[PDB]
Symmetry: D5
Subunit: 156 residues, 10 copies
């Protein structure tokens, strides 16, 4: 039976505990995802308070971190989502993604309506991934793929 949260505090406190135990055991997010059968972006988001995990995955990650059954039960609950509820990010790393939306937000709207029609690209029927690729200039680039269902607005 699915349980849900009405406030962020319990799952943010669990995320605090994950960050601490992960650092103490010198673990990576990839290591916590290994063996769950789920995607790196989904499992990491769940541990940071933004998704529930299915029971089997929750128990797997909880064993790796040394978390108990109470923690696993909480990880399986549907959270109250939002990773920056208290204002636009000040952190440069997070801010750049907001800046991408500032520069291209109106473009995304315009091109969605041209290429698809009236409606939205879903954030729920939706997958996200990030990959590192080499830049021909020698550096590296992050390629973030947003893959969302088009939901049309139809007259009724």
């Amino acid at each position: 039976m699915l349980q849900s949260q009405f406030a962020q505090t319990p799952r943010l406190a669990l995320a605090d505990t994950v960050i601490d135990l992960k650092a103490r055991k010198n673990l990576s997010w990839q290591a916590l995802t290994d063996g769950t059968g789920l995607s790196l972006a989904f499992v990491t988001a769940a541990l940071l308070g933004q998704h529930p995990l299915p029971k089997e995955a929750a128990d797997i990650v909880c064993g790796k971190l040394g978390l108990d059954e109470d923690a696993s039960r909480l990880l399986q609950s549907v959270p109250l989502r939002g990773s920056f509820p208290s204002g636009v990010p000040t952190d440069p790393t997070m801010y750049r993604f907001y800046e991408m939306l500032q520069v291209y937000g109106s473009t995304l709207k315009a091109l969605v309506h041209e290429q698809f029609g009236d409606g939205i690209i879903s954030a729920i029927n939706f997958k996200l991934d990030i990959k590192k690729v080499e830049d021909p200039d020698g550096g590296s680039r992050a390629v973030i793929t947003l893959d969302g269902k088009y939901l049309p607005t139809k007259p009724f």
Copy 2:
């Protein structure tokens, strides 16, 4: 001498004109991008006030819309960027991209630091692309690629 704007008002008024003339001439954003040698998302963003265009591309787009030499010069100016300066978007289409950042923002930070290191993904050394694909369950999906250079923090 490259020129720049100190306020959004002139380029937003020019964007207003573009929207109106594009509708009057029944044009697409793709048609305005055709012949510029630049990508759809970049030219559309420029027309909506978020990038300068080089002189050649500015003159081509202005020719298609019936805009004069003053408009083309304004289009070649460096703008004061930002497509939603007056609050989080209320428009559902733009809001969904903000929601993606709310759910995955902390995950993106965590995975950038794991896969790249301390630093940022650029929003200016940056490419944006939208593809429309078929949805297996019926309908269509948008696959949006954000491609940004990794810039490391420099200890000093």
Copy 3:
């Protein structure tokens, strides 16, 4: 080719014109919906700047109001939506619906997750209806029906 707006100013000015002409001609919202084949809530929202109308409906409503082809083209454009972008409403009539959300918002979330699962009730695959009913206590009641698709959040 479908056209879209990047700012609210043009459609809000058209809505201003609609309000003025509707009053001068002593028309009702029901009369403006009559003959479109569309629902009262959808057509009224479109006229107030929150939806595009298809060409045939746009042409019919503009005929009743005495609006020209430029207005009809604008009415057919996809708007930048949001009926209160400048803060929580002060108007008592609109505020009561906001108050309903303040009192029951956490309940709606909890019961959606219990009866449907993780995910959302859609605001896009969505229909709205308002009915007037006579109250046994004397007077009347409004029965507002929100009818939205459940979109599940699935692990990936």
Copy 4:
């Protein structure tokens, strides 16, 4: 003597305990409502801090959860209401209901004044219910009914 709260902190803390105990005991919101004679939405809202319960109902739900007399006394107090006092929700499930109000808020006002008159649809003399129905595509829909008394504004 009926008692009331002047701050949200105690009832939010009680709601915290309800969420935790219902998860620990594998109870549903419907299970807690059973036997109170009150509607699911009302009892759930009360437990989440937005209504008082009558003594009989409060003792019923507290008995199921293992909460003591101090908790039941607090549940019987009139709360300081508001389920999102610290900003527009970031949670997608809650946000969609806010978005419905952004798109249709001005329409609701217009149609209330046309069909009822000057005045408001009450959020106090008011009932809310949520029903799950099938969608033809094999999924499901939520039909949320808002049923409020019309209170007229009359000259004085």
Copy 5:
């Protein structure tokens, strides 16, 4: 058909005109209320954009100010209400009433629930009046009466 406003701008502009003409003709608010059969507080609020007037009263006030049929029709339309939509007042005269609410707001809630019960004192089924009385210490006092219907919150 009763008409309504969706934006404040037309009625605020009409209020602007009223203020200017009132000053030019050396009129009082009492003089504009005289002959309408309505209360000073209601007619004054209507002229300042916060209520509609019935046709007869609207034509009378409009006659005293020299306003035409267009102004009178607008005065008869249901407004989008709110006399300070852009922040807490800075004006000392209005601010003091806000301060009374800051000092006594929690007291009013506490005493309403004790003397009436759970529910609200209505701002819609509501009358306001201001009286001037001589202060025994010299000077004068304003006695402002707020007279609102108690609307109970009952379980459903």
Copy 6:
């Protein structure tokens, strides 16, 4: 020596204690006022953190609630006043008074200047009272009297 607070936290914590003890003893606000010689609204506001009480009254109310000398000393200290410092109220009961000010705020200013002159109605040389009347339409009404000294603004 009269003492004063620089932060709300201690008196808000004392108010928390008052609410809890009042509920445990099934007391009314009227019972706490009885025997102090002061008005219900003043004593209630003091206990909710918005006024100091004189020593005699502070000792009487503390005796009824079971509060010690430390609580009484704090009740005698001048508070940092303000019953909603963190935003416009979400609670329906408190909000209605704010709405009253939104609708009639500009009217109150206009009528004060007409009937008194330039200046303010005091929130300091000020008395507040709430009375219940059993209204012929069935139910009851609250009659709230705001009684404030007129303080004129004079050239200097």
Copy 7:
């Protein structure tokens, strides 16, 4: 009959005209105050939209600037006061007075309650003066005197 404003726009527009005409005639604020019989701070505040002037003073100031009777009548109206309604000042000169309040605001409250009692120092029964003094260490100092009536808070 004393007239009053409900919006700042007319007096801000008059203030714009004053500033422009003052610059064209190379006048000082002191020259505009000369002959009115009123204080420099009061007349300057009036011209900047924050006080009404008496008829005789309004006429004298209007004659020196070349302003007409419409301007004088508006200058005699009671304004909607507030010189920074749109946020904390960014201007360094005004900001320093705000900073004085940030550093010493809690001290001013504490010392008012110690030296006077519970209550306020009036901003209405109030005089402001600024004086220039030479600094013994070279340069000059501004001595700004705030002179306000103590209004006590008394139990009722």
Copy 8:
């Protein structure tokens, strides 16, 4: 070596202790300042978290309050200043000083530039004092003196 704070929390907690011990010992702000050789406004501000005290004065006031050497070391640290960081004050006593700036802020700017020139009146090279004077019309007045150095803005 001079120490400094980067967050307000420690000095606000110390100010909390000062307020409590001052009340327990029935001391005045004047009594705490007397014997330090410093001005009442400076020492009171320091104790409320807004200035560091020199070692000799810090130990003297700590001796009067019964505070230990840890507290004195904290009182000697340069604070992160600001007595209302969380919004415009709601407290009437503090608010009147803010209202004074709302009414006269633009006047102060205007007269500073006239009597001194471009630049600022300093809030750092600055002294404040408060003086109680008797009012001829019965009662008392506060005379608050702000005394700041003029720092000119010169072209460079």
Copy 9:
């Protein structure tokens, strides 16, 4: 007599015309500074509304831009300063300077207090310059020098 502005609108409108005329004549900011005898950063800031220019410099730059005597007089007026009064910048170029303050703001305070003492680094007795330097590792760097007088906070 030195003149000053009380609102930003005139100088922002003048800045608008500067930007437009500078682009039409294809001028550089350096070209506008040449011949004034003043620094590039000061003259540019003046033209963008943030400083007054001396008469001779104002007349020189106005001659180069084709602005008339009215514009020069406005350029000689002391402005109401602030280049982003309407929120944190969205433009990436301006935002980075804000981001440096976000990252290093607490460090600047700490190191100012250690190296200088209690007090401030002045923004008024202050010079700014920006210089382009080659980066030893490739590309270019901007070196922005902030040169401000230390003003100590001393006890009084």
Copy 10:
């Protein structure tokens, strides 16, 4: 594996400890920087929560303060950066740097586009330095150097 923070709370609590221990041992920021091989501004920012330290440097600074291995591990984690996430600073020392951005922000943008081109000055590839210089007029000045890489916008 590099670790990162998702919330500011742990590194802000460590900064609290650093400040306390630094004062207790009467240390300077320079003494904490000595031996790290890093610059004063970088190490100080790291200790205040704004940068990770390399292991060697983290261990050295922890040895000077009496901090354990948990503190050092935390200092090596990439922080969620931002030294004023809860509003514009009230602290005068910090505020002056914000004020320099208010006065010169548009100038910096303008001159970056003139001297470098379209793009930004980095806050990430960035060095900060403070120098104390004696003022000829008596006293001292801070010469603060901001040294950031120019990052060009890449059209695509």
